[PDB]
Amino acid sequence: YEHATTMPSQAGISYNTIVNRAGYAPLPISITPTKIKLIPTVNLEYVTCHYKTGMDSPAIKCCGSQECTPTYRPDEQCKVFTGVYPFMWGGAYCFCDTENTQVSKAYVMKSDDCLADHAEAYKAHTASVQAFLNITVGEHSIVTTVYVNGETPVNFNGVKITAGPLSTAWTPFDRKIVQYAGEIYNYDFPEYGAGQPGAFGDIQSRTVSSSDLYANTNLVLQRPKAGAIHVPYTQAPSGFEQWKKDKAPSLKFTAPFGCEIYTNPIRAENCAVGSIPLAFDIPDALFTRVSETPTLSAAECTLNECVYSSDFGGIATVKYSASKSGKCAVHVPSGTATLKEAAVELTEQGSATIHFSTANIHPEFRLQICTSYVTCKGDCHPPKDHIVTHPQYHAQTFTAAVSKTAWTWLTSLLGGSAVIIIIGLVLATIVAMYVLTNQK
């Protein structure tokens, strides 16, 4: 047997369905997504951390001149300052008052803590979806991590399930993302080799252990103070630390649809968007003929309690006179109510209670049991809580909460005016016919 159903991708909410055949007992299928993941494929563009300005010891030449060694290091700069008179703790270093030179040389390296305190700039694309479903079909229950691509089935007890593809291609991560301290930021970082001073990525390394380093920090060399041995320099402040000052909240705080962002691997969990289409291939072994299953008779539904709350705020009691004990795949074909139980135990004679959740102020649905179709009606009342901590299990119809007094008033306004128009038209036609027939 083949089925094609579709269930909302709302984690933590069970979803029940029934399968019917011409000469087979109905069977219940319950799917519970405990966790829905979205794992984009990410490429490590580069790694950024705090830099460290390293200066070579000044090359002091007394009564002479020096030349600039050519540049070979990240952001490396060299300059020869003439007319210096350095001092040390012993005393004056040179004996010439002038024509002394000092070579100052600076460059940029990664900080010693780049192995731990670093941010990884990634390119994110090609999202993939996985779902951890508790699946119960034919009183057979399993747990499976099914991929939500439409290509890969999952098999168990001869049953085949093909999930996906996901209805919506939406993803929280954009093309360029930044991972730092276990948090993901949607940041438009500069490309490798295109970093700018004082901003994120001012120094870039391909890998945390890589031997390359692009540095752009506006390093310049100043003249040493008179009678001093040091290498003055001026730099734009670190772009990593400035970025940390102005990160803005991470994706776990700014993502839509309630997504929860995790790292290692970079993923988004429990996004309440889209719907998973399921394709079922069920072997005929699980199916049972109508004779084998109990057949229901003399069943009446009473709504002894109903509040149209988000949770199962309704109880329906059905009086039944069944042929034999067994199991019924209790289900409501309409969207009026959502049933907590996908199956109910059945005895020879008695009453069965079913917990249901509805958004209708005046509910009236066709509860389906093993074979019977009971018509169940009642009245519901507003619940206590203004706010709850769980999503609504039912679904809101356009005419869900419309009462009956509203129907009476609307029919009187829309339906009484039509009556008045009909009366006027009849009177006009009668008068016209009367005068026309009374001319001759």
Partner 1 sequence: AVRNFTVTEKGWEFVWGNHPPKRFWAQETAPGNPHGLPHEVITHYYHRYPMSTILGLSICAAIATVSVAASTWLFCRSRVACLTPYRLTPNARIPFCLAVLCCA
d(CA 48, CA 111): 10
The yes or no reply on residue 134 touching ligand NAG (CB under 6 A) is yes
The yes or no reply on residue 143 touching partner 1 (CB under 8 A) is no
Best CA proximity match to 179, nearest among 110, 267, 58:
267
Stretch touching partner 1 by CB under 8 A, among 30-38, 116-124, 238-246, 414-422? 414-422
Residue 217: exposed, middle, or buried by beta-carbon count in 10 A (0-12, 13-18, 19+)?
A: buried
Stretch touching partner 1 by CB under 8 A, among 1-9, 60-68, 209-217, 405-413? 405-413
The yes or no reply on residue 92 touching ligand NAG (CB under 6 A) is no
SS3 assignment, position 431: helix
SS3 assignment, position 396: coil
Q: Which of 16, 32, 48, 102 binds ligand NAG (CB under 6 A)?
A: 32
Q: Which of 258, 265, 283, 350 binds partner 1 (CB under 8 A)?
A: 258
Q: Which of 34, 82, 145, 275 binds ligand NAG (CB under 6 A)?
A: 34
The yes or no reply on residue 211 touching partner 1 (CB under 8 A) is no
Best CA proximity match to 130, nearest among 29, 271, 282:
271
Q: Which does 427 bind (CB under 5 to 8 A by kind): ligand NAG, partner 1, none?
A: partner 1
Q: Which does 433 bind (CB under 5 to 8 A by kind): partner 1, ligand NAG, none?
A: none
Other Cβ atoms within 10 Å of 319 Cβ, number:
14
The yes or no reply on residue 248 touching partner 1 (CB under 8 A) is no
- Do 204 and 187 touch, CB atoms closer than 8 A? no
The yes or no reply on residue 411 touching partner 1 (CB under 8 A) is no
Distance of CA 387 to the CA centre of its chain: 23
- Residue 256 phi, psi dihedral angles, 5° rounding: -80, 170
- CA torsion sign for 117, 122, 127, 128 is negative
Tokens of 6: 């579709």
Question: What is the per-residue binding string for partner 1 in 57-96, x denoting contact by CB under 8 A?
Answer: ----------------------------------------
Q: Which does 405 bind (CB under 5 to 8 A by kind): ligand NAG, partner 1, none?
A: partner 1
Residue number, 156 or 409, with CB nearest to partner 1: 409
Q: Which of residues 314-373 bind partner 1 (CB under 8 A)?
A: 359, 361
Q: Which of residues 138-157 bind ligand NAG (CB under 6 A)?
A: 143
- Do 360 and 287 touch, CB atoms closer than 8 A? no
Residue number, 10 or 32, with CB nearest to ligand NAG: 32
Q: Which residue is nearest to ligand NAG (CB)?
A: 134
Least distance (Å) between residue 143 CB and ligand NAG: 5
- Name every residue whose Cβ is closer than 8 Å to that of residue 42 and which is 6 or more positions away in sequence: 122, 123, 124, 177, 265, 266
d(CA 146, CA 148): 6
d(CA 114, CA 96): 45
Residue number, 105 or 267, with CB nearest to partner 1: 267
User: Can you give the binding site for ligand NAG, defined by CB under 6 A?
Assistant: 32, 34, 134, 143
